[PDB]
Amino acid sequence: MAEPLTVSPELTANYAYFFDLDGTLAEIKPHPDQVVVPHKILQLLDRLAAHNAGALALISGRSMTELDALAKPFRFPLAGVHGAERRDINGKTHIVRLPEAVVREVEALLRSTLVALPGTELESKGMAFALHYRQAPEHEAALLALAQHVTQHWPQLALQLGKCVVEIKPKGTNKGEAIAAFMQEAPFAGRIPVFVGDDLTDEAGFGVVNHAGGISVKVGVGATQAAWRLESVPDVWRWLEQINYP
Numbered sequence: 322m323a324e325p326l327t328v329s330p331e332l333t334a335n336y337a338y339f340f341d342l343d344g345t346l347a348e349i350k351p352h353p354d355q356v357v358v359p360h361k362i363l364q365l366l367d368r369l370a371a372h373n374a375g376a377l378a379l380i381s382g383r384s385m386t387e388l389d390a391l392a393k394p395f396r397f398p399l400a401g402v403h404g405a406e407r408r409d410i411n412g413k414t415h416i417v418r419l420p421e422a423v424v425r426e427v428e429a430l431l432r433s434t435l436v437a438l439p440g441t442e443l444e445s446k447g448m449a450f451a452l453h454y455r456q457a458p459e460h461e462a463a464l465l466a467l468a469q470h471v472t473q474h475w476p477q478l479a480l481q482l483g484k485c486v487v488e489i490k491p492k493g494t495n496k497g498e499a500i501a502a503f504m505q506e507a508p509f510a511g512r513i514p515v516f517v518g519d520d521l522t523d524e525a526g527f528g529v530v531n532h533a534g535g536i537s538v539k540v541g542v543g544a545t546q547a548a549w550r551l552e553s554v555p556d557v558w559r560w561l562e563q564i565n566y567p
C-alpha cells in the first residue's frame with residue numbers, strides 16, 4: 322500500500338522535518354547503549370535543519386538526555402518518552418508529571434514481577450516504564466499481560482508496544498500530539514510536516530502527518546498507514562545525503 326520513496330526534497334523547501342531515532346536514524350542494536358548515529362549523519366541533519374529555519378526535531382521513545390548523548394554535540398528540538406518530554410526551539414522543556422505514589426507502586430510491582438522472567442529488563446524513565454525482552458522473547462506475552470494489568474489499575478497509564486519492548490506511558494502521550502505541539506510553534510508553523518519512523522508508536526505521527534497534507538515515511542518491513550516506505554536505515558542515510566547534495 323505504501324509506495325517506495327525514490328525522490329528527495331530540495332534542501333531549501335518549505336518542509337518541517339521529524340525523525341525517529343532507533344531504527345530510523347540509527348541501526349537497531351542488541352543493547353541500547355551500543356546505538357550510534359554516525360557523525361556525518363548528524364552533520365547532514367544539522368545542515369538540513371539550518372537550511373529549513375531550524376524546523377527539525379527528533380521524536381523518539383528515548384529520554385531527552387539520551388537523545389542529547391546520541392546527537393552530541395548537536396542540540397536539536399526534541400520529543401522524548403513518546404512525547405511525555407519535549408524541548409522546543411527556545412530550549413524550554415515540558416515534562417508530563419505522574420503522581421509520586423503511582424510511580425513508586427508501579428515500579429515496585431514491576432520489579433517484583435520481573436524475577437520470574439529472567440532476561441527481561443525494566444527501564445524507569447521518570448514518567449514511564451519500558452519492559453525489554455530482546456534477550457528473552459519468550460516472555461513477550463507475559464510482560465504484555467502484566468502491563469495490561471497496570472494500565473487497568475492505574476488509569477493514568479496507557480500501553481505502547483514496540484519492537485522487543487512493552488512500554489507503559491502516561492495516558493494521552495503519543496508521537497502524534499508531540500508533532501502537533503511542534504507544528505503550532507515557530508519555526509515549524511507554516512511548513513509541511515515530514516515524519517520518518519519505523520515502529521508502532523510512529524503510526525500515530527504518520528496519521529497526523531497524513532491529515533495535514535504532509536509526507537509520512539515508513540522504514541523497514543511491516544504494515545503501515547505511511548504513504549511512503551524506505552527499505553532500511555542506510556536508505557534513510559542515502560535519502561538524507563541526497564537531500565543535502567543532489
Ligand SMILES: OC[C@H]1O[C@H](O[C@H]2O[C@H](CO)[C@@H](O)[C@H](O)[C@H]2O)[C@H](O)[C@@H](O)[C@@H]1O
Pocket residue numbers: 343344348349350351352353356382383384444451453455483484485486488
Ligand atoms: O536499538 C537499540 C534498542 O532500541 C529499542 O529501545 C529503545 O527504543 C524504545 C522505544 O520504545 C525505548 O523504550 C528504549 O528506552 C530504547 O532503549 C529496543 O527496545 C531495544 O531492544 C534495542 O536494544
Ligand SMILES: [Cl-]
Pocket residue numbers: 341343381382383520522
Ligand atoms: Cl520510539
Ligand SMILES: [Mg+2]
Pocket residue numbers: 341342343344345518519520
Ligand atoms: Mg524506532
